[PDB]
């Protein structure tokens, strides 16, 4: 406890000795409170380029409301000795499997610096006002070694979280986390090839094909249960099992990673703004509070573990979570060695998001381990059996569903989809300040090229994407201040479409290139409507007919630049 968090608490208390006070009206019941001190200190801005080219959606509240505008302070009971054993055995088998074809290794100042000099979201907090300033100041790199040497010495002074669910930290604490645990993401530990259940690096154009491949397996319904507040249900045992990745390390690396887990993850210090505006200094040992990138890989690991145990429960590998007989301990082991790899292949897991095709439907009511691990399902009663999906094209995953779409030439595309109001509403929103008109235009172009590559099958989005690309100067480079983003390019979008959907698509045997957009199909007209199309409305007809007037409005605002007309790529403007 304070033998681990005190130096951080002491350092903060002194920097605010003038305002230090043990407030008696602290609202915390699960988070340990330490003290308070004095301070005084983020809306979604509209993208004008996208909004002027999507006029019909100006009167659709599901779009327009997206731009406008309790669980962390809860506890998670300790699992039962049978649960804690199932988790330990499974977590041991899983780190060994993930480690068979990979080597844990430290990530480098050079690698960190290259990532900061390319605008990667490292959940950092404002000596220097930009990350680039710190990584360009041998004084910034002088602070790390002190704490780095403190970590090698098993102590921590400056690794404190700022709650804003994103727990930000000083760039130096982020570096130390990246050096020790960045290898999980940088070396693709959760790739489907290495993890079997994972989809890290896959891309939205691959996820539907992956779910269709899971659907091919013999077995029961496809289950896609969401957890209620996954990051808040992470137990101190879960952290212990995640920490076992250090059993595969050596030297400096082993000690640097052991310190991240012990000092930052299993014993956190957090700063939180309370309007009553003060700063509260609180501590808790459980729950997830690491960096987003590390959070993703450890959530994927612990979710893979939890779903294999739910599969074992459905198959009768054990009978009760109270106590695991030494015999069962050997049955659980022999199950993992004999069929563990096959079982991981029956799943698609992206952090807290899973799809599972179990051996049969006993899985639906196999709930004792899942509830006792604290991974309580959302929107269902605790012993109410799960609702499965009978058709892979109906399963939700990574905020999408997937359509099977047949090209006029017979070839099969499996495409990503979601309600079109969500897509249009998100493209109309920008985050941050000081956006020039050029920077706003280039963010609109990023959305447009994403729509051309992923959502070409939606009539409204192919038309709006063509309009935005016509309205923004042809050589201006797509930008985003904040999968695999193949749309982030100035290459011709037909050439990129061919590369992604034909040349590099391992599910497409015939590699004949597509010569024009007119060849590339849409959903059926009624399916497009079901998924939120405005086709058939008078507002949409007037927009499509008059689109050149909308394009010319935006071109007149941007000014006298070089533009290309992409509308004749469509059938109706040709
Ligand atoms: O009015 C329609 C229409 C229709 F006639 C039948 C079914 C669904 C529809 F949306 N369409 C005009 C808008 C552009 C492309 C879709 C066709
Ligand atoms: Cl279904
Ligand atoms: Zn530290
Ligand atoms: Zn759809």
Automatic annotation (TrEMBL):
<feature type="binding site">
    <location>
        <position position="299"/>
    </location>
    <ligand>
        <name>CTP</name>
    </ligand>
</feature>
<feature type="binding site">
    <location>
        <position position="417"/>
    </location>
    <ligand>
        <name>Zn(2+) 2</name>
    </ligand>
</feature>
<feature type="binding site">
    <location>
        <position position="151"/>
    </location>
    <ligand>
        <name>Zn(2+) 1</name>
    </ligand>
</feature>
<feature type="binding site">
    <location>
        <position position="353"/>
    </location>
    <ligand>
        <name>Mg(2+) 2</name>
    </ligand>
</feature>
<feature type="binding site">
    <location>
        <position position="147"/>
    </location>
    <ligand>
        <name>Zn(2+) 1</name>
    </ligand>
</feature>
<comment type="function">
    <text>Regulates the ATPase activity of the NS3 helicase activity. NS4A allows NS3 helicase to conserve energy during unwinding. Plays a role in the inhibition of the host innate immune response. Interacts with host MAVS and thereby prevents the interaction between RIGI and MAVS. In turn, IFN-beta production is impaired. Interacts with host AUP1 which mediates induction of lipophagy in host cells and facilitates production of virus progeny particles.</text>
</comment>
<feature type="binding site">
    <location>
        <position position="403"/>
    </location>
    <ligand>
        <name>Zn(2+) 2</name>
    </ligand>
</feature>
<feature type="binding site">
    <location>
        <position position="229"/>
    </location>
    <ligand>
        <name>CTP</name>
    </ligand>
</feature>
<feature type="binding site">
    <location>
        <position position="226"/>
    </location>
    <ligand>
        <name>Mg(2+) 1</name>
    </ligand>
</feature>
<protein>
    <recommendedName>
        <fullName>Genome polyprotein</fullName>
    </recommendedName>
</protein>
<comment type="function">
    <text>Required cofactor for the serine protease function of NS3. May have membrane-destabilizing activity and form viroporins.</text>
</comment>
<feature type="binding site">
    <location>
        <position position="401"/>
    </location>
    <ligand>
        <name>Zn(2+) 2</name>
    </ligand>
</feature>
<comment type="subunit">
    <text>Homodimer; in the endoplasmic reticulum and Golgi. Interacts with protein prM. Interacts with non-structural protein 1.</text>
</comment>
<feature type="binding site">
    <location>
        <position position="156"/>
    </location>
    <ligand>
        <name>Zn(2+) 1</name>
    </ligand>
</feature>
<feature type="binding site">
    <location>
        <position position="352"/>
    </location>
    <ligand>
        <name>Mg(2+) 1</name>
    </ligand>
</feature>
<feature type="domain" description="RdRp catalytic">
    <location>
        <begin position="220"/>
        <end position="366"/>
    </location>
</feature>
<feature type="binding site">
    <location>
        <position position="227"/>
    </location>
    <ligand>
        <name>Mg(2+) 1</name>
    </ligand>
</feature>
<feature type="binding site">
    <location>
        <position position="378"/>
    </location>
    <ligand>
        <name>CTP</name>
    </ligand>
</feature>
<feature type="binding site">
    <location>
        <position position="531"/>
    </location>
    <ligand>
        <name>Zn(2+) 2</name>
    </ligand>
</feature>
<comment type="subunit">
    <text>Interacts (via N-terminus) with serine protease NS3.</text>
</comment>
<feature type="binding site">
    <location>
        <position position="230"/>
    </location>
    <ligand>
        <name>CTP</name>
    </ligand>
</feature>
<feature type="binding site">
    <location>
        <position position="226"/>
    </location>
    <ligand>
        <name>Mg(2+) 2</name>
    </ligand>
</feature>
<feature type="binding site">
    <location>
        <position position="159"/>
    </location>
    <ligand>
        <name>Zn(2+) 1</name>
    </ligand>
</feature>
<feature type="binding site">
    <location>
        <position position="231"/>
    </location>
    <ligand>
        <name>CTP</name>
    </ligand>
</feature>
């Amino acid at each position: 406890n304070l033998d681990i968090i005190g130096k951080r608490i002491e350092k903060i208390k002194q920097e605010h000795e003038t305002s230090w006070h043990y407030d008696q009206d602290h609202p915390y019941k699960t988070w340990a409170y330490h003290g308070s001190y004095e301070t005084k200190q983020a809306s979604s801005m509209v993208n004008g380029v996208v909004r002027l080219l999507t006029k019909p959606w100006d009167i659709i509240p599901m779009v327009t409301q997206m731009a406008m505008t309790e669980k962390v302070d809860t506890r998670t009971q300790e699992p039962k000795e049978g649960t804690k054993k199932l988790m330990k055995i499974t977590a041991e088998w899983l780190w060994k499997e993930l480690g068979k074809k990979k080597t844990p290794r430290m990530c480098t100042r050079e690698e960190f610096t290259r990532k900061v000099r390319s605008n990667a979201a490292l959940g950092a907090i404002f000596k220097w006002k930009s990350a680039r300033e710190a990584v360009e100041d041998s004084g910034f790199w002088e602070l790390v070694d002190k704490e780095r040497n403190l970590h090698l010495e098993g102590k921590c002074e400056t690794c404190v979280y700022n709650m804003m669910a994103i727990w930000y930290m000083w760039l130096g604490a982020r570096f130390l986390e990246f050096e020790a645990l960045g290898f999980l993401n940088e070396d693709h530990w959760f790739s489907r090839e290495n993890s079997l259940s994972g989809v890290e690096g896959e891309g939205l154009h691959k996820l539907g094909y992956i779910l269709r491949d899971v659907s091919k397996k013999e077995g029961g319904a496809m289950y896609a249960d969401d957890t209620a507040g996954w990051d808040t249900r992470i137990t101190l045992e879960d952290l212990k099992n995640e920490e076992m990745v250090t059993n595969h390390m050596e030297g400096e690396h082993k000690k640097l990673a052991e310190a991240i887990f012990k000092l930052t993850y299993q014993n956190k210090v957090v700063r939180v703004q309370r309007p009553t505006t003060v700063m509260d200094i609180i501590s808790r040992r459980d729950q997830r509070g690491s960096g987003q990138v590390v959070t993703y890989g450890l959530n994927t690991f612990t979710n893979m573990e939890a779903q294999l145990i739910r599969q074992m429960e459905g198959e009768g590998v054990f009978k009760s979570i109270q106590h695991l007989t030494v015999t069962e301990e050997i049955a659980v082991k022999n199950w993992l060695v004999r069929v563990g790899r096959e079982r991981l292949s029956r799943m698609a897991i992206s952090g807290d998001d899973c799809v599972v095709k179990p051996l049969d439907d006993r899985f639906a009511s196999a709930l004792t381990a899942l509830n006792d691990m604290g991974k309580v399902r959302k929107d269902i009663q605790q012993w109410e059996p799960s609702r499965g999906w009978n058709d892979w094209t109906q399963v939700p995953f990574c905020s999408h569903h997937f359509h099977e779409l047949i090209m006029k030439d017979g070839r099969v595309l499996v495409v990503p989809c979601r309600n079109q109001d969500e897509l249009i509403g998100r493209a109309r929103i920008s985050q941050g300040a000081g956006w020039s008109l050029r920077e706003t235009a280039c963010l609109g172009k990023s959305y447009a090229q994403m729509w051309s590559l992923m959502y070409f099958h939606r009539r409204d989005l192919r038309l709006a994407a063509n309009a935005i690309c016509s309205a923004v100067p042809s050589h201006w480079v797509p930008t985003s201040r904040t999968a695999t983003h193949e749309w982030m390019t100035t290459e011709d979008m037909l050439t990129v479409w061919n590369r992604v959907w034909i040349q590099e698509n391992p599910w497409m045997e015939d590699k004949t290139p597509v010569e024009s957009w007119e060849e590339i199909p849409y959903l059926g007209k009624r399916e497009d409507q079901w998924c939120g199309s405005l086709i058939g409305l008078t507002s949409r007809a007037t927009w499509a007919k008059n689109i050149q007037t909308a394009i010319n409005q935006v071109r007149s605002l941007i000014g006298n630049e070089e533009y290309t007309d992409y509308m004749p790529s469509m059938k109706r403007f040709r």
